[PDB]
Write an enzyme that holds these catalytic residues in place. Structure first.
Site, short mmCIF file in Angstrom:
data_model
loop_
_atom_site.label_atom_id
_atom_site.label_comp_id
_atom_site.label_asym_id
_atom_site.label_seq_id
_atom_site.Cartn_x
_atom_site.Cartn_y
_atom_site.Cartn_z
N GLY A 1 0.80 -1.21 0.00
CA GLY A 1 0.00 0.00 0.00
C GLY A 1 0.84 1.27 0.00
O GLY A 1 2.06 1.22 0.17
N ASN B 1 4.07 -2.24 8.83
CA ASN B 1 3.40 -3.53 8.71
C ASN B 1 3.63 -4.46 9.91
O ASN B 1 2.70 -5.12 10.38
CB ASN B 1 3.91 -4.29 7.48
CG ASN B 1 2.93 -4.28 6.32
OD1 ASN B 1 2.82 -5.26 5.58
ND2 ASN B 1 2.23 -3.17 6.15
N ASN C 1 3.07 -10.96 3.68
CA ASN C 1 1.78 -10.31 3.76
C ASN C 1 1.35 -9.76 2.41
O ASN C 1 1.99 -8.87 1.86
CB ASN C 1 1.81 -9.17 4.77
CG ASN C 1 0.53 -8.35 4.77
OD1 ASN C 1 -0.57 -8.91 4.69
ND2 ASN C 1 0.66 -7.03 4.86
N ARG D 1 -0.52 8.28 8.32
CA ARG D 1 -0.26 7.47 7.14
C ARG D 1 -0.27 8.32 5.87
O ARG D 1 0.40 7.99 4.89
CB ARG D 1 -1.27 6.31 7.05
CG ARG D 1 -1.19 5.35 8.24
CD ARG D 1 0.25 5.12 8.73
NE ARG D 1 1.14 4.64 7.67
CZ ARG D 1 2.46 4.54 7.79
NH1 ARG D 1 3.07 4.88 8.93
NH2 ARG D 1 3.19 4.09 6.78
N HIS E 1 -7.93 -7.10 5.95
CA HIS E 1 -6.68 -7.38 5.23
C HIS E 1 -5.45 -7.07 6.09
O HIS E 1 -4.32 -7.17 5.62
CB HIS E 1 -6.65 -6.51 3.97
CG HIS E 1 -5.58 -6.88 2.99
ND1 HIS E 1 -5.46 -8.14 2.45
CD2 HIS E 1 -4.62 -6.12 2.40
CE1 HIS E 1 -4.48 -8.15 1.56
NE2 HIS E 1 -3.96 -6.94 1.51
N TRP E 2 -5.69 -6.73 7.35
CA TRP E 2 -4.64 -6.33 8.28
C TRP E 2 -4.61 -7.25 9.50
O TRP E 2 -4.50 -6.79 10.64
CB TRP E 2 -4.96 -4.90 8.71
CG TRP E 2 -3.80 -4.04 9.01
CD1 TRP E 2 -3.67 -3.22 10.09
CD2 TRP E 2 -2.64 -3.83 8.20
NE1 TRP E 2 -2.49 -2.52 10.01
CE2 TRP E 2 -1.84 -2.87 8.85
CE3 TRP E 2 -2.20 -4.36 6.98
CZ2 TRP E 2 -0.63 -2.43 8.34
CZ3 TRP E 2 -0.99 -3.92 6.46
CH2 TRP E 2 -0.22 -2.96 7.14
#
Lengths: 271, 271
Positions: A33, A41, A100, A172, A250-251
């Site tokens: 991302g 991450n 991941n 972020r 997704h995390w």
């Protein structure tokens, strides 16, 4: 900036990475991302695993704080070469790998080309199979900087949106606009993006040859990679286990941290 | 005979059961094969779990060494009543429940009718959804006594057939022909057997209402219950996790004993 760690030349690229713990080596490979980095991450994963293993988490070339070589040719094979270069540079002869998403596809590709260098694998919401591009992934790869656009991506990534605060979106967003970050990111996975899902995937035939003990992890509500993709990996890889977390996106390593760390550590402990 | 344990009156039926350990109560509910009993199903599970919990494993009415009342009316509801009767008899106000196949369907039904009596659930290759009858289940329920027929069933149950020895087939064959066992078994699930899969199942609507933290377990190669059934339960139950073991059949607790016990104990430890 805690995202900046140690520096080492790997595969000819000055690489930023984290190295914590002693013992059996475990390589953690991040997602893809905007503003992503090994630390972002794995900040909640390294502390837990480093108590029993030597944890190495590098910023893949083109991401984080690793150098972005002029005219560098990014590809599944080049990224695999970077991973191997990192292992060679650190005298890591064989290691477990936690990949991941983006990193999961790279983990599979590395195990296929350098089988002797990979022990056990953990593939989370992993790339590796051809699945129809999702609006989630197209939005992630099609990111344009703004706190609102980042908030939307964070919402896409997690099940519990209450975790998406103005501060997190701000932080972020700032990470995504660091010098050269957005420029290399926007040119990394251009439309049509189905091409990159396919390029990062490995054939059913090849995946079936993997002899490694494997742990496949997926969040039921993952909006970026469909559960069907991980179910497929679970049917293709012989020595595989599939763990699906309900109420999880997704995390996984961040959304279900304790359960995730427990499962992974015990998985490696078997070896 | 280690399959014979303690005796207690429950729901008006003299019940054979095992009770080991102290602390939080956990009820283990066995499957429905010929000669099945709580001990045969849970001999490798009780020792591990009893170190941290009070483990209760009863022979459901109609199975094992529990009484088989003359003209007893067997049904999903009657079996649920037996489970509750057992809990009442032992002053177990609330407990976690591990239901294996047949027992998994009963666990779901119990949680639906007596929500206040059930805490966390573990459903292994569980009944509970309507799935097309498999040749595996039809063979299991259609069993006729013989060492060869038992060997075939044992082969159907496990992934690694090397575990199916002449001695095991002999011992389980003998268990299947004990006084009154085959008589009650053959009359328990008569053709057409799809009727019993459907009768033991719970509606999608009802299953969606379950608030319990749940751990769904399934062996990838399960020949009796298709993985698709557990995947369905994993989509219906909100607080659910699904763990699929590759290279594993319908006998997960025996085929992947250590992994299974570890996952289950840690699952209950969270509470």
């Amino acid at each position: 900036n805690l995202e900046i760690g140690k520096s080492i030349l790997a595969a000819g690229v000055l690489t930023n990475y984290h190295d914590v713990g002693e013992g059996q080596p475990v390589i953690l490979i991040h997602g893809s991302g905007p503003g992503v980095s090994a630390y972002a991450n794995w900040r909640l994963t390294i502390p837990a695993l480093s108590k029993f293993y030597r944890v190495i988490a590098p910023d893949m070339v083109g991401f984080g704080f690793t150098d972005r070589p002029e005219n560098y040719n990014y590809s599944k094979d080049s990224w695999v070469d970077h991973i191997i270069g990192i292992m060679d540079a650190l005298e890591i002869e064989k290691a477990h790998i936690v990949g991941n998403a983006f990193g999961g596809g790279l983990a599979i590709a590395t195990a296929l080309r350098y089988s002797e260098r990979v022990d056990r694998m953990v593939l989370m919401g992993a790339a590796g199979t051809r699945f129809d591009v999702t609006e989630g992934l197209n939005a992630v790869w099609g990111y344009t900087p703004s706190i609102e656009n980042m908030r939307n991506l964070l919402d896409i990534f997690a099940y519990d949106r209450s975790l998406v605060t103005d501060e997190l979106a701000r932080l972020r967003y700032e990470a995504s606009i660091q010098p050269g970050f957005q420029e290399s990111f926007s040119s990394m996975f251009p439309e049509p993006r189905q091409r990159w899902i396919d390029a990062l995937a490995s054939s059913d035939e090849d995946i079936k040859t993997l002899p490694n003990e494997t742990l496949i992890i997926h969040g039921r509500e993952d909006q970026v990679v469909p559960l069907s993709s991980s179910l497929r990996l679970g049917e293709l890889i012989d020595r595989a286990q599939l763990h699906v977390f309900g109420r999880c996106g997704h995390w996984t390593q961040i959304e279900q941290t304790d359960r995730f760390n427990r499962l992974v550590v015990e998985f490696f402990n078997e070896a």
